[PDB]
Design a protein around this ligand. Sequence first.
Ligand SMILES: *[C@@H]1O[C@H](CO)[C@@H](O[C@@H]2O[C@H](CO)[C@@H](O[C@@H]3O[C@H](CO)[C@@H](O)[C@H](O[C@H]4O[C@H](CO)[C@@H](O)[C@H](O)[C@@H]4O)[C@@H]3O)[C@H](O)[C@H]2NC(C)=O)[C@H](O)[C@H]1NC(C)=O
Ligand SMILES: *[C@@H]1O[C@H](CO)[C@@H](O[C@@H]2O[C@H](CO)[C@@H](O)[C@H](O)[C@H]2NC(C)=O)[C@H](O)[C@H]1NC(C)=O
Ligand SMILES: *[C@@H]1O[C@H](CO)[C@@H](O)[C@H](O)[C@H]1NC(C)=O
Lengths: 28, 135, 184, 184, 227
Amino acid sequence: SEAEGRLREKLFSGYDSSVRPAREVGDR
Amino acid sequence: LNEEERLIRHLFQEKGYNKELRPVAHKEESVDVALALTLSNLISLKEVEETLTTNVWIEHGWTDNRLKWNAEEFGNISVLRLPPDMVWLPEIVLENNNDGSFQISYSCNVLVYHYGFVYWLPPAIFRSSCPISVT
Amino acid sequence: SEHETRLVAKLFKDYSSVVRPVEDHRQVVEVTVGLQLIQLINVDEVNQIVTTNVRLKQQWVDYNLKWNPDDYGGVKKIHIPSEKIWRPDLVLYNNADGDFAIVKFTKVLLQYTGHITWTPPAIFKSYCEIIVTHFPFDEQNCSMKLGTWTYDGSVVAINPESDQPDLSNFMESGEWVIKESRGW
Amino acid sequence: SEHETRLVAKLFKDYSSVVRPVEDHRQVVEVTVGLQLIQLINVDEVNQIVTTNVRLKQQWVDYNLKWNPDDYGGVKKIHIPSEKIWRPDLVLYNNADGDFAIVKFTKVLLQYTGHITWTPPAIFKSYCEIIVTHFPFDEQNCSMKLGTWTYDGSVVAINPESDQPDLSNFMESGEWVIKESRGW
Amino acid sequence: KNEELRLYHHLFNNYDPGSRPVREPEDTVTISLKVTLTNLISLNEKEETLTTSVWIGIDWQDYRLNYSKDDFGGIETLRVPSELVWLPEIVLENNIDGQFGVAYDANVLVYEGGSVTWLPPAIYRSVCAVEVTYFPFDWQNCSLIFRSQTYNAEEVEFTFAVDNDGKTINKIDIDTEAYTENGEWAIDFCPGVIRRHHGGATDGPGETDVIYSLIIRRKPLFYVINI
Ligand SMILES: *[C@@H]1O[C@H](CO)[C@@H](O[C@@H]2O[C@H](CO)[C@@H](O[C@@H]3O[C@H](CO)[C@@H](O)[C@H](O[C@H]4O[C@H](CO)[C@@H](O)[C@H](O)[C@@H]4O)[C@@H]3O)[C@H](O)[C@H]2NC(C)=O)[C@H](O)[C@H]1NC(C)=O
Ligand SMILES: *[C@@H]1O[C@H](CO)[C@@H](O[C@@H]2O[C@H](CO)[C@@H](O)[C@H](O)[C@H]2NC(C)=O)[C@H](O)[C@H]1NC(C)=O
Ligand SMILES: *[C@@H]1O[C@H](CO)[C@@H](O)[C@H](O)[C@H]1NC(C)=O
């Protein structure tokens, strides 16, 4: 699962789980 | 406990154990989880609420090859007691509960053997749905 | 205050609460267990459950949590959160529908010699076979079996503090009289 | 939402939820409180307790939670966890056997001007003198006193949002009719 | 620039809430105690449980949290979360439901001169054995026993708080204007006593607690009319 580990680390680098994911400002 | 402290340091910090990842060599594999149930006492069966209250001990057994060591290299240590939050867990729950208590009651220590076997015997008080035949 | 702060920083700089509190792993942790019965809250004969209020005194030596008082302004005892240290995992083996283990993690009293006394409260809901043959003139023998859930006798040893439970602070019961009490 | 990510990281880099959210300590924190009654759950006459489902809308301004939208792609409003920020400690003074304070920490709406709106839910269990003289034809005047537990009026000022509680989303009761309602 | 932030950093940058506010280990921390009852919710006779709503006024000195208003722009009070300061850990010992602590962890008020005040509210379900002999024309003696969970009498001691006139408030305080009497129970008396014991050589370190004795009277009107 070392590929899974690297993918998870890359996925959550700089990720903020409190911010709603809107591609651009104003998107729903 | 030079030996057990050194062993835990070797397993979890030196080798970078990640409890988020399953103990598999490749993702397409599946972890074999053996389960047994021991009924400590049947507390009750309430007919009006149709609820079975039981005290059970769930024996979980699986293999985690990341947690293997040579007993002779670490002072003939053959078994370790670790907090369950330190290792990956096969999170089993009671699906047919009727009160929201999906999980085991007391998260006891896991027992990890040198040959990679993780044994875990959490006890639980479970309140489950049991439809009643009043005939 | 500064001495206690420096001591607490020293003791837990490289401390592990996962590893047992001994100098060699081949040694057995010696735990003295004593029970204080504060109140017999209720005896439920239908579900066969005795609910009691208890204090579960546990005494043991921690090898790494020692210090010289002379080096710390004569501090001979301190109070530490129980969550921060290794503890014995005593469980009520005959729990009926309450908590299996201690949930109220009060502070432990730690001496300079390494001796730790931890006296958490608990509400024990234990399963007791009720014999209703002579009810309401019945006599009931209700037990509370305590043991280290995950540690066997080769790694952790438990010994009673006294032959009998501590009933010195036992509240009077309006329904039951305790004729005899004994710990084996 | 990289703009909002950068904004949230900037707003809380050196933020304190301990101090009152004012530029200068001699200033008072102006809080607008409005109670919305969703449901009248129960009127326990024996224990003199009224159980209600409520929404405690609280509005203030945090001096240190401002930004220019042009510097963040035009973001004018965000939703953030309430636990991270300073909040007023509104307490139901006449709580009977429920929670004294808000325990459901829902998100706050923060505007770029620093304006915060926080509308958490609560189950208020309030102590009310119940007059049974005229039961089953009785009328009951039940109150909910709300105040900042630890902050006095010289550091935190509370003002009603409206002269009456908000009953726009009130669920009809099958046991009571609210003849009158008012906030003082 | 808020002076509260500067004061908070000055007081709490180097501060240990785990250590008692004593310059020597052998010194004792004196705790001034008041208990204000807001409501008597009930006395369940089947469970022998007294449910009350109170708030505990706890005052003491913390020399580490000592500051002057002149050095911080005239600030005389600072509110901080109670988890950041040392607390004596007062609990109701004779609770029946296993709830030892308070219901809401309110902020502590730190005044200039090192004075620390904590006024948390609480819902207590206490043990009260019901003397049944003259039921329903009965009166009860329900105890509220408060003690430090952690510290012995040599480490933490209790004193009663004083009113404006200096009179010692050795009783349960009740705000007359806000008090609504229980529908079945009238509070006739409520003295309080500070007890010290277990101070013998064989006993070892001395222990202390504070016991309030609510002498309450039943209003038997329901039983008279209906039964
Ligand atoms: C409501 O409850 C409280 C608490 O139970 C109660 O106050 C307590 O009353 C007892 C007496 O019933 C007090 O005990 C006494 O303490 C003094 C020392 O302070 C002793 O000298 C007394 O000794 C006499 O009684 C002994 C009985 O064993 C005899 O052996 C001895 O020879 C003496 O005759 C006695 O131990 C106790 O100190 C108080 N607790 C307090 C005030 O904190 C109160 O009276 C009750 N109120 C009612 C029923 O109105
Ligand atoms: C808290 O700090 C104040 C100063 O801010 C202390 O007051 C000083 O007390 C000494 C006597 O011990 C005097 O010689 C000084 O002149 C005082 N200073 C000022 C500016 O008043 C005070 O003693 C400290 N201790 C506590 C806990 O009050
Ligand atoms: C373990 O057992 C072997 C013999 O099987 C012995 O030589 C050794 O000293 C023991 N202890 C250690 C530290 O390996």
